[PDB]
Write a protein that binds this DNA or RNA. Sequence first.
DNA 1: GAAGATATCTTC
DNA 2: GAAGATATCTTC
Lengths: 244, 244
Amino acid sequence: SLRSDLINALYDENQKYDVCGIISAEGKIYPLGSDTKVLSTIFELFSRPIINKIAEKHGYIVEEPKQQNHYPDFTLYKPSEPNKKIAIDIKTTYTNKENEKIKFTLGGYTSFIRNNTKNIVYPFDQYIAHWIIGYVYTRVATRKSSLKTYNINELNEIPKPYKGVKVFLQDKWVIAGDLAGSGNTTNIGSIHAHYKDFVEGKGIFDSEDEFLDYWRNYERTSQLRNDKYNNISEYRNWIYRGRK
Amino acid sequence: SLRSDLINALYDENQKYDVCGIISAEGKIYPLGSDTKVLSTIFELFSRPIINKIAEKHGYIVEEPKQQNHYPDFTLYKPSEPNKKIAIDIKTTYTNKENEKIKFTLGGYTSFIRNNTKNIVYPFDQYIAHWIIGYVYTRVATRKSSLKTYNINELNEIPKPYKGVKVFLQDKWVIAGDLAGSGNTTNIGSIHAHYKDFVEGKGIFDSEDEFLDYWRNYERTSQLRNDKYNNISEYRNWIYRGRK
DNA sequence: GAAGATATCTTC
DNA sequence: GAAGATATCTTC
């Protein structure tokens, strides 16, 4: 499908290429940093051409936000299906040691999921799928060699600020958890699990609708949540007790 | 001085080079996006090797954070002078037009400026200077070639996601304003001005200490601030009335 | 201007 | 766990 094609394209691309720096048109190379502020951006840019290749070959139009801070990174839709859009968002996190638990922030829980037109390229109801391309890299301490510029034929001399980058595509609802991903920035937290649970889709919500509802009624602070619900069990009991 | 040499070196690199993408060790090129989450990271890395070079020419050890959200981007210091460290931060903003007013977020007003050791590589009292390397770009839109990947002999075809980047170096207190630069994430706001005034140093505070005192006592919300002070003027009257 | 969005992590 | 930090922007 588009999806299985996308993931194979993703793994493939990830297996064959290791990003090492930013190149200037004049040919000069600036190495990278080993922090997520850098790598999430790098990984976002690394994905762009892959998603578009695969998308294109499946008859889908690829549209990026024109304005800043509008979900999603990538809006996909067959021209014949304007109301069957697929939102693709790229998220990154790190691991201190290769093979340890990860967790992602899954976007706002007080923005577009609460306001059909807020911070989004197309009204939310126009999307049928919300996919997450999650990159995970193992941190690598910066070396002195990073503080230098490089030439095109010194690429492998350039040090990488990561090790073990693994990628996955999964449905946002299937990887969502019941714990906030951020505090002041009110993000949905994903499940706290190892890379494979994200691939295999080891979620905790029964459907995409349960996901959306839990998050639509999640209170911003623990004080407010402790008198309503704070985890999937208490949500269900809250639904049961009549919402409440 | 380290500073005039830094500013000049910055000017010149920015003048001789245009960042146009990320490069993989294998030579494949993914072009850049047009938002600041990309360009800030890009201008940030661009600056790394320039700052390092000038600091070493001037006999200064350069230190980046080991830790992730620890100011400053660069801690420069002469071995001989451990308590006379200089903090350097790279910040980016954009203009829809080519020469319009700009403003920067100058970092938190509730972290290291309030707790000597919070979110900072070295205690705040070991820094005798806090510099800002500011980048401004005019946003340009495209895609007629941004969603493809290029090869090294193709750097020329790549579209650059910006126009008119300008860079300046200035003491944070000298460009600090009196209005928050962010709400929930509590950032210091710079002055709202033209590129020239930042270069110039057309600030509003009397001294770095007035800058720090204003910001250390700034209430997080307007409700709290309307009963105290909300601008340099009211703050001064507040100092006068006996810090009350 | 004020508050809260964009994404992700560390601190408390 | 919660809350608040990292940086910058848009929305209100």
